[PDB]
Amino acid sequence: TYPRTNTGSGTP
Amino acid sequence: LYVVGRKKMMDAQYKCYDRMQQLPAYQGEGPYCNRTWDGWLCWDDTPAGVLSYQFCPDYFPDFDPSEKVTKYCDEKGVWFKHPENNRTWSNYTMCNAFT
Ligand code: NA
Numbered sequence A: 001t002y003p004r005t006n007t008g009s010g011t012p
Numbered sequence B: 001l002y003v004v005g006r007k008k009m010m011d012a013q014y015k016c017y018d019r020m021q022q023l024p025a026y027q028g029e030g031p032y033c034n035r036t037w038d039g040w041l042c043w044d045d046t047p048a049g050v051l052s053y054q055f056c057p058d059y060f061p062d063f064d065p066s067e068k069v070t071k072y073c074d075e076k077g078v079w080f081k082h083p084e085n086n087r088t089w090s091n092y093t094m095c096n097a098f099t
Helices: B002-022
Strands: B051-055 B069-073
Touching: none
Parallel strands: none
Antiparallel strands: B051 B069
């Protein structure tokens, strides 16, 4: 398991 | 493995600009969204009103490269912008939705 990648506003 | 993911990302970025430099201007008709590097993925010239998609990248350990990223080119030929900060935004949410 790993930290979750952000995919919200301010990301690509 | 994050060192490798970043390297993959920077290679794709360089490759994207090479691709955008070499392909001829858009040959289609009517309004369209311009080719662009969105920060993680390269997108080609896209007709107005089209929801473009491609595979998720593998830069991050929780990303599934068999899922799809979507990017919406609206009917005025403008890439979708996130309403929170009004900047162009591709939809990577399915890349790690089911991890
Ligand atoms: Na170049």
